[PDB]
Amino acid sequence: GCAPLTGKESGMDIGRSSTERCLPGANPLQDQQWYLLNSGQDGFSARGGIAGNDLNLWWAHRTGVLGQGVNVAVVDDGLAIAHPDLADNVRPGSKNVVTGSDDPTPTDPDTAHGTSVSGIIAAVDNAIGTKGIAPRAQLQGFNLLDDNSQQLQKDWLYALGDSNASRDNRVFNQSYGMSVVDPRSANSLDQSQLDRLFEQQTLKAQGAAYIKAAGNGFNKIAAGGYVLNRTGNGPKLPFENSNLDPSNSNFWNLVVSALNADGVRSSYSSVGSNIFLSATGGEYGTDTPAMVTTDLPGCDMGYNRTDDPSTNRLHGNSQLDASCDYNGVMNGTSSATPSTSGAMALLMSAYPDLSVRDLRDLLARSATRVDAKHQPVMVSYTSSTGKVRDVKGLEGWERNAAGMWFSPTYGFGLIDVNKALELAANHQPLPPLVQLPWQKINVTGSAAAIADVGNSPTSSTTRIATPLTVEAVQVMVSLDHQRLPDLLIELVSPAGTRSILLSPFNSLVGQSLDQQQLGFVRTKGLRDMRMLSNKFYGESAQGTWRLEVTDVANGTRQVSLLNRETRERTTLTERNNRQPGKLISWSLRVLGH
Ligand SMILES: [Ca+2]
Ligand SMILES: [Ca+2]
Ligand SMILES: [Ca+2]
């Protein structure tokens, strides 16, 4: 009841509420994949969301744009390559790094994450199960995250493009990330080696798009042998800012946040200045929709199996899924990532030979400005000189000096595949990427001081002399401070545009953790911590850029701890610094054209 379209219907409304909006196909579960097309259906959960909040890909599907000829790598916990709704799309070259074989299928029943990821991207278009976002894309799986994987550098390289088997993928799906309580540098040998690989693979003629989950730490993370979350008084700032995983600021990664079926940020989604776009991840599939996708086959394996019940109605279900080959509980930025990988494969199938940067440009300029009125999250405190200040800790939607709308929650906005394809038709390639040399400032004197609940930020500046249009900016920062989450770290462009690189009250509570279990503190502060902002996309680079750091808190905070080994619950107390912090150095790298 949804016919094929040609290229060439005049008067075609490609939008989210068009009368032409429908998905072709005979996949029995596709009408409960709200992420393909959101009609307010419940995804087998207790209730539906709001119609239109989806990837707006229906016109791609109707015109036969389906991911044909695009190779997607799923680097994850496994991939059941024989799955009845995946096998047709599996091409040769998967590697099981636990067994040595070509078959990354898991043998552990809980290891269903990568198979669920794969279905969102490329479940086969046929008369069973679901329909993938890009149902003619071809998959490989590399099970780097199986419980018994050693997660060896050699295998990460193999899976992310540095072997014969994987080099000719044009999309790398990384539904994974790191949570931390102490800051990390991005300069380790292993990290820089992967960054060199991602640079090579992105910028070459057959260029590959790396896609990366922002994290699911808005409220809780697991790190250091614990599950941690804040409790008590406090602003609604993410516990995990998306700039914390050092990998998320490497530029080559397109980092995505998760959106739910109501058209707002998924409760758990990490956010920050480095989010490029928002894509569909849902909630939990219990009370509200999550991602209907391919499960490990059988009722003894996967997220849909007898031993791991769910209130999602697809799971118990002899009528709709008698061999428990599908599930309704897949979620997370882990799901926003394949939603993005799928969108990217659709674009690449229509316009092969546009660069990754051009595809980013199209995705950014075509994104939907969802949740347009969400407010900034403010931090109020009495400053050191007696004045109450109320400053942004996280922005809402803001328009930069070049006219581009951006938010740390949604990036440039929710993916709109149909509109990206409309823009692509007459898109002129961007000029080649220019990566300006790093500019490092070594800060000295009384300008280094960061006062407790400062009345003004501590500022340090550097002038970019080169005319350039900005795409992204990277910063590295070094400072001393005895209670890191008190710090708000911002970057200001020559136009006066601001971007919060690190929101305060994040998960960097490890100094307090160390005091409690060791009796001393290992972390003095940030050391070459990398952050990235997309806020400045389109702006002129020439002029003075300003790093501004403020300590915005002198009150005590409590953090709840759950010991992962011993389910014992304890309480961590962050006590105020009581010696002023110190900026040591920072570096700026402008990436543009
Ligand atoms: Ca199917
Ligand atoms: Ca199953
Ligand atoms: Ca403080």
Domain spans in the chain, listed from the N-terminal domain onward: 18-429, 430-593
Per the annotation, the verdict on 113 as an active-site residue is yes
- Distance from Cα 255 to the centre of ligand 1, integer Å: 28
Report the distance separating Cα 103 and Cα 99, nearest Å. Answer: 9
For residue 310, what are its two tokens? 């769910």
CA-based Rg of the chain, rounded to a whole angstrom? 23
CA gap 556, 534 in Å, rounded: 33
The reply to whether 77 belongs to the active site is no
* Amino acid in position 20: E
CATH top-level class for 430-593? Answer: mainly beta
Given CATH 3.40.50.200, say whether it is the number of domain 18-429. Answer: yes
**Per the annotation, where are the binding residues?**
27, 85, 124, 126, 128, 130, 295-296, 298, 301, 304, 324, 452, 486, 551, 553, 576-577
Binding residue ranges for Ca(2+): 27, 85, 124, 126, 128, 130, 295-296, 298, 301, 304, 324, 452, 486, 551, 553, 576-577
Distance 112 CA to ligand 2 centre (A): 8
Q: Closest by alpha carbon to 178, among 234, 79, 249?
A: 249
Method: X-ray
| Nearest partner of 161 among 115, 118, 202, judged by Cα | 202
Listed in order, strand segments (DSSP E) in 397-455 are 398-399, 405-406, 434-435, 439-442, 449-450
Q: What are the tokens at 485?
A: 């989450």
Q: CA 130 to CA 15: how far, in whole Å?
A: 23
> How far, in Å, is the centroid of ligand 2 from the Cα of 74?
19
Catalytic hit among 42, 45, 61, 76 = 76
Distance 291 CA to ligand 3 centre (A): 41
Q: Which ligand is nearest to the CA of 295?
A: 2
* Contact of 376 with 327, CB cutoff 8 Å: no
CA of 265 to the centre of ligand 3 (A): 29
Nearest to 259 by CA among 290, 227, 222, 217: 290
**Residue 502 bridge partners (DSSP):** 489
Query: Pairing between strand 557-563 and 226-231?
Result: antiparallel
Residues in the chain after which the chain is broken, C→N over 2.5 Å: none
Q: How far is the CA of 129 from the centre of ligand 1 (A)?
A: 4
Is residue 335 part of the annotated active site? The answer reads no
Any residues with CB less than 8 A from the CB of 281 and at least 6 apart, and which? 258, 259, 260, 266, 269, 290, 291, 331, 332, 333, 334, 335, 336, 339
Return the SS3 of 318: coil
Residues whose CB falls within 8 Å of the CB of residue 519, separated by 6 or more in sequence, listed in order = none
Termini Cα distance of the chain:
46
Candidates 275, 501, 289, 255; CA nearest to 370 is: 275
Q: Which of 201, 186, 203 is nearest to 249 (CA)?
A: 186
